[PDB]
């Protein structure tokens, strides 16, 4: 099964967003081969923010 799809519009937009926001300041951990848990935490943060 597959939950995320990095080839869509909003996922690719967020991908480019974090790629641009990482060249200036180094992130704590690398972002190569991302897992579904990262996307789940992102969606949870967005849910909390919208609520």
């Amino acid at each position: 099964f597959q939950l995320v799809n990095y080839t869509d519009t909003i996922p690719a937009r967020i991908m480019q967003q974090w790629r641009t926001s990482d060249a200036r300041d180094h992130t704590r951990v690398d972002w190569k081969r991302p897992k579904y848990t990262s996307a789940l935490t992102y969606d949870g943060v967005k849910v909390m923010a919208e609520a």
């Epitope: 790629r19 641009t20 060249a23 200036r24 300041d25 180094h26 992130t27 704590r28 690398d30 190569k32």
Partner: single-chain antibody, 229 residues
Framework: EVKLLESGGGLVQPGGSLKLSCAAS????????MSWVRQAPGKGLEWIGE????????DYTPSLKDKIIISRDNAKKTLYLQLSKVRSEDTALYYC????????????WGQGTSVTVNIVLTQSPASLAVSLGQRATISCRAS??????????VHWYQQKPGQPPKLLIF???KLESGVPARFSGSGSRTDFTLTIDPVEADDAATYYC?????????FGGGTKLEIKR
Amino acid sequence: EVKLLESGGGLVQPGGSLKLSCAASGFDFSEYWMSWVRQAPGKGLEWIGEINPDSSSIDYTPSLKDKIIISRDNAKKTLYLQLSKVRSEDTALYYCARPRGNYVVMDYWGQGTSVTVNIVLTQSPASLAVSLGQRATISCRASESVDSYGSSFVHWYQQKPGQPPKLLIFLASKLESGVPARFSGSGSRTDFTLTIDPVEADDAATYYCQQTNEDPYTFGGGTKLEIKR
């Protein structure tokens, strides 16, 4: 390991436009960022062209926007450091670089070309000489904050005369590929310190400690390393 091969080395006439094309061998740069930073002769580097993996935000320099034209393609993996109406003071050593600002796996600069048209990154010692198989541990002090979430956001790239600057460490917690586990960089809120052991003849170059956590993200003061015998 990506290996960018630059093409178009040589001089140029005045009034035209110098288009420097650098082919990226190994794989494509669609998922990896790109950057074309020029380097002066004997001095540090200079961030002129800022790009992204998919080449979405091709940011220009704050004072060299009219002397550079970013135009590349992620699916082609072939950048083009073009310009328009270059001046006479643009005589430097242009060079490309693979993803280094957001990649610490296999970050390595490009080949480069030759053409003749706060933060105090002070490293110590700037010049030394060690015997064969010896050990050397140089330091690199800074004026701004050097502590960024424990892992010091700084690297150490050594450059030789005529060769491009090759990266050795990354974020003081992961060394570059190719070279073995012989360069250990560290530092705790005081100064970046990188120890190399054992010394070899290939390490006879001019090292430089660069930090990406403070402006500017260019090369440091330069530490010449001579392999004495």
